């Protein structure tokens, strides 16, 4: 059976908001170690990977591994009604959500009824403020359907083109940095230039409230990895296949 308490309930609200628009239904893989979610979108262009470690929770019990098919819109709606306790019995078709912050609200959510990316190094890795990255993707999606991302040691460029015209955004490698989190840091072994659908990047930037920082990992002819840290708990990775 599974039982976990998260005093910072807000994290779980944000995680769901970051996911529900891209993924309707997913299998939450729960173990002694923590929570795992891996799932592709219905159009098979992208894949999300969530990790929430057991140590990120206040209390946590999982006797043995169990998987729960979760409708993410339903869980979002339930989480919209929120100290959180999650509880699933053995052999059950419901997850129980018990909220707090005398008043107690109990929600019983109905449950529903293989393929993994290998681990690799990347030619070109970019760290930047997450708001800056969200803004860039939002802006450029008003010019075209796709972004060309060019990653070199001195900077990263984003370019779109469409009916109205074209646009180029250049961010330099930051230098005299005041705060760590406002830095634009690039680690380049090989330069890379690849094309990605902006519709999907704007799905990914819904994870912005989780983290002040986003990490972009690229290699030639392989999927883009967009990474958000979940402070003290884990991470959320989005993978996006190139055009």
């Amino acid at each position: 059976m599974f039982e976990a308490r998260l005093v910072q309930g807000s994290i779980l609200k944000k995680v769901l908001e970051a996911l529900k628009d891209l993924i309707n239904e997913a299998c939450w893989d729960i173990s002694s170690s923590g929570v795992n979610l891996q799932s592709m979108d219905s159009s098979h262009v992208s894949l999300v990977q969530l990790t929430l470690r057991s140590e990120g929770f206040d209390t946590y019990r999982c006797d043995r591994n169990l998987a729960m098919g979760v409708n993410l819109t339903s869980m979002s709606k339930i989480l919209k009604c929120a100290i959180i306790t999650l509880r699933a019995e053995d052999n059950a078709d419901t997850l129980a959500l018990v909220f707090e912050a005398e008043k107690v609200s109990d929600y019983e959510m109905k449950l529903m009824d293989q393929l993994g990316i290998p681990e690799q190094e990347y030619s070109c890795v970019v760290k930047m403020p997450s708001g800056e990255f969200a803004r860039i993707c939002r802006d450029l999606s008003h010019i075209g359907d796709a972004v060309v991302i060019s990653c070199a040691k001195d900077g990263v460029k984003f370019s779109a083109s469409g009916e109205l015209g074209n646009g180029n955004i250049k961010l330099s490698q930051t230098s005299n940095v005041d705060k760590e989190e406002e830095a634009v840091t690039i680690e380049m072994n090989e330069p890379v230039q690849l094309t990605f659908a902006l519709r999907y990047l704007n799905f990914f930037t819904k994870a912005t409230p989780l983290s002040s920082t986003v990490t972009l990992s690229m290699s030639a002819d392989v999927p883009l990895v967009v990474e958000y840290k979940i402070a003290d708990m884990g991470h959320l990775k989005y993978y996006l296949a190139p055009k």
Partner: peptide
């Protein structure tokens, strides 16, 4: 297509 990258 991302499937062709997944093992």
């Amino acid at each position: 297509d991302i499937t062709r990258f997944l093992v």
